[PDB]
Structure formats: C-alpha cells, structure tokens
Design a protein around this ligand. Structure first.
Ligand SMILES: CO[C@H]1CCCC[C@@H](c2ccccc2)OC(=O)[C@@H](C)[C@@]2(O)O[C@H]([C@@H](C)[C@H](O)[C@H]2OC)[C@@H](C)/C=C/[C@H]1OC
Length: 460
C-alpha cells in the first residue's frame, strides 16, 4: 500500500530525475481514452489522486463536432486544424508548439499519427519536453529496413535471406539487372526489390518478372542503391513486447501472435505456437536489439515464424500498439503507466508491475536480472483479441462474459474485442459467447465461424 503525495515526491523516492505531471496526448479516439484511463488508474493507486497527472488533448473540428468522448474526459483540450492528420495529430511542429506553450512536461503519441516520426522526440527534447516513447536516435536506427536488418544480423538475430546477408558491423545492394538476377537466384522468389532511398519498391514473384520490375525501380529513383529481400511464404507474424528504461535495461513481456490475417484480424497472447525455448531466444534477441539501439519505453520486435520452425527479424515498431491490452492482461502490466514512469526516469526494477511479474516484492529496490532470467515469469492465462468492422468511442460491456471487453470507434466502424481466459480454450470460448451477444452482425458471424474451426482451435 505504498502511496505518496505528489509526482514530485514519486520521482525523488523512486529514483527518477524528471517530474511529469501534465501530459499532451497527440491522438484521439480509443488511443486518447486508453492512455488517460490507464494513467489515472495508476495515479489513483500511487497518489490516491486520479487527477495527479493532468491531461491535455488535441481536438480537430471533426472530433469537436462529433463531441468525441476524450474531449471532456481530458482536463484541458486544444482545438487544432481539420483535414488530413499532417494538419493535426501527425504535425510535429504543431505538437511541439502546443506542448511548449501550455506548457506540458511530456507528450504521448500512442500509435498512428506521428508516433513513428523520429522528428517528434527530436524536436520535443530540443525544447525540454519529454516523450513517452523512444528517443530520436533509436528511431532513426530502426527507421529504415537495411540498417535495421544489418544491426540484427550482427547481433546474431536471424534475418530473412536478402542481398545484404552476411554483412556485419563492429555492398548489400545490386547495380545491374544482371547482378540482381544473380543475387535473386541465391535468395529465391518471391522477393522484394527496394531502392534504399525510397516507396521505390516491387514484389517479384519469379525470375521472369525480375528484369522489368528491377528496371522500374531504377527508373523510379535513379542512382539509388537497390536491395533484394526474400518474402516469407505463409509465415506467422509474432511480436515480442519489450519495455526499456533510460538506463540500458530492457525486459520482454512475452509476445503476441497474429493467428489470422491484411489487417490483423485475430491476435493472441501469449504466442503459444512456437516452442517456449525458441520464443525465449526471440525474446532475448529483442532485448539485445533494443539495448544496442538505445531503445527507451514500449516497443515491439516483429518476427516472421515459418511452419518449419524458423523465425526471422522483421522490424522494431517504435510505439505502443492498439492490441497492447492482450499483453497487459497476461503480464499484469499497466503499459501507459509504465511509459510515464520510464519517461520520469524510473528504472525498470523500480516499476511495481515489473517487480511483481518477477516474483519480487512490489516496492523493493533491488535490481532484477531481465536478460535470460533463471526462472522466467509465467504468462497469466491467455488472451484473444478480435478486430470487428462495419475519435468517437463506444465501449462494449458483455452481460454474457465478465472477462470480455471491447469497443468500436468512428474515424463504418472499426474496433476490437478482448477476451481473457485461464487457458487458450477458455479464452476462445469466452470470445464466442460475447460475439454472439454482439449480434443483437456480418463480421461476428465471420469471426465466430473462424474461431470454431478445428484448425484454429488446434492452432496450426
Ligand atoms: C479504455 O479503457 C478500457 C481498456 C480495456 C482494455 C481491455 C482489457 C482486457 C484485456 C484482455 C482481456 C479482457 C479485457 O484490459 C484490461 O482490463 C487491463 C489489461 C488494463 O488495460 O486495464 C486498465 C489498466 C489497469 C491497465 O492499462 C491494464 O491492467 C494492467 C484499466 C484502466 C481499464 C480500462 C478500461 O476501461 C474500463
């Protein structure tokens, strides 16, 4: 029951270095609502004051007119220009201006908008405002495929066969249609042709298509180095959730599997499809990759997992994702709260949810071995999340299942349902009961059919 009186006192007593008590959310809809609800629950527990951390939000004319819920939920709101998001939520310069003027001490971008633009943390730090996300230098490194892949390889993180295979740090590009055909022959089709300076990209399904498509890329961005990368045929997408503080520690929070797809239609946590011993290496690979780029906050290492059992690095998504509650549930970690705490300079082993996940005492101050732990924490139960289809937010409470929750939002409606159970089967079964309630209809019939097939219930 450790509580304190103010954020100022929390920072001091938990080993941090920066007081954050007002945050600007550069987002709307479910992102804005989730951020505030997670952090206020944390402020309540820590400060006995749910409003100890104050929130300012950006609002477009379209969101105002709709009376989007997150407007009144916020402590203050700022009207911003309408139209495409480069005029509002993805406008780095606008975001920094507002942040600086209020002032707030931190920005949260969530997912979408400028959440992957390195220029955001860059310009914020330059103006003394914190970011609940990675620093620009980390984002720049993971930002482009080639450097990202070469970083992974050198760290022993397996990468897909590509023209730069073998390269290492302490000519992965082709020049001609003829050099390209040679490299393509070693790599195999289907494959990606990408000019490293672009788009400027083409999928070559065979070697007969290679010349035209390669030449197209050369025409599109003349002079740019071209690289070739294998496309995984019918691989699973697996994600490792990592959390990294400002002191060089990163911890994994198991991972998620995309067991149905071009949108992620169904996602699960944990990812049970892979043997635990290899997923554990996938986790350790993500930690090391995060550490060497200087990653801070929440991020996802995305992997391709094939049926034969091979996995390959795909990318580091430098932001929290909308499906993060799957992970939050099986790990019992409040992720937005963790980001806020980390942006205040609290180290991972002083995060109370991290200590509890690791069988330590909640307020202990002892360090924890995160990279290859001896007895790794166990995921708590299992979560299924399903995307439902066709900044205003409507929550779904199900009288049929106390362990299912979801929402749908208008920019036709997209949204997600989340189902927990004590195991994978209980989780799938709770989801089916709720979707059937939901049909008080076309996408649920679609999802119910899918969840009821032998193939899915046996996961392969
Ligand atoms: C927009 O607010 C919604 C978001 C619900 C997301 C789905 C749900 C869930 C996940 C899997 C299966 C079933 C349900 O996640 C949860 O309840 C859990 C994991 C979690 O997000 O709860 C929030 C925090 C304590 C923290 O972030 C995390 O706890 C560690 C609280 C503030 C609940 C808020 C909700 O509003 C009432």
């Amino acid at each position: 029951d450790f509580t304190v009186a103010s954020p100022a006192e929390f920072v001091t007593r938990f080993g941090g270095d920066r007081v954050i008590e007002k945050v600007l959310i550069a987002n709307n809809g479910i992102a804005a609502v989730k951020c505030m609800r997670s952090i206020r629950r944390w402020a309540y527990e820590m400060f006995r004051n749910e409003r100890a951390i104050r929130f300012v939000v950006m609002v477009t004319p379209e969101d105002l007119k709709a009376n989007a819920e997150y407007i009144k939920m916020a402590d203050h709101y700022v009207p911003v220009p309408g139209g495409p998001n480069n005029n509002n939520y993805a406008n780095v310069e606008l975001i920094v201006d507002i942040a600086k003027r209020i002032p707030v001490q931190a920005v949260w971008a969530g997912w979408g908008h400028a959440s992957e633009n390195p220029k955001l943390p860059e310009l914020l730090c330059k103006n003394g405002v914190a970011f609940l996300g990675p620093p620009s230098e980390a984002m720049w490194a993971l930002g482009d495929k080639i450097a990202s892949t070469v970083v992974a390889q050198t760290l022993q993180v397996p990468t897909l066969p590509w023209s730069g295979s073998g390269l290492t740090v302490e000519k992965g590009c082709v020049k001609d249609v003829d050099e390209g055909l040679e490299a393509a022959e070693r790599i195999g089709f289907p494959l990606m042709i990408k000019a490293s300076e672009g788009k400027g990209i083409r999928k070559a399904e065979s070697a007969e298509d290679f010349p035209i498509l390669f030449r197209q890329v050369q025409s599109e961005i003349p002079g740019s180095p071209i690289f070739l990368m294998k496309l995984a045929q019918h691989a699973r997408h697996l994600e490792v959730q990592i959390l990294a503080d400002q002191y060089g520690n990163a911890v994994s929070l198991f991972g998620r599997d995309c067991s149905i797809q071009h949108q992620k239609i169904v996602e699960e946590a944990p990812a049970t499809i892979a043997p635990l011993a290899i997923f554990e290496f996938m986790e350790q690979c993500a930690i090391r990759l995060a550490k060497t780029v200087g990653y801070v906050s929440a991020g996802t290492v995305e992997y391709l997992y094939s049926q034969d059992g091979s996995f390959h690095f795909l990318e580091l998504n430098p932001r929290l994702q909308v499906e993060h509650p799957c992970t939050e549930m099986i790990a019992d970690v409040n992720l937005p709260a963790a980001q806020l705490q980390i942006a205040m300079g609290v180290p991972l082993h002083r995060l109370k949810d991290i200590r509890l996940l690791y069988g330590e005492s909640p307020w202990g101050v002892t360090p924890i071995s995160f990279e290859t732990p001896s007895n790794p924490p166990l995921a708590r139960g299992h979560v299924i999340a399903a995307r439902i289809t066709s900044g205003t937010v409507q929550e779904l409470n199900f009288r049929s299942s106390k362990n299912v929750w979801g929402y749908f939002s208008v920019a036709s409606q997209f949204g997600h349902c989340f189902s927990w159970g004590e195991n994978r089967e209980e989780a799938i079964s709770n989801m089916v009961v709720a979707l059937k309630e939901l049909s008080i209809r076309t996408t649920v019939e679609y999802l119910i059919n899918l969840l009821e097939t032998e193939s899915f219930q046996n996961n392969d």
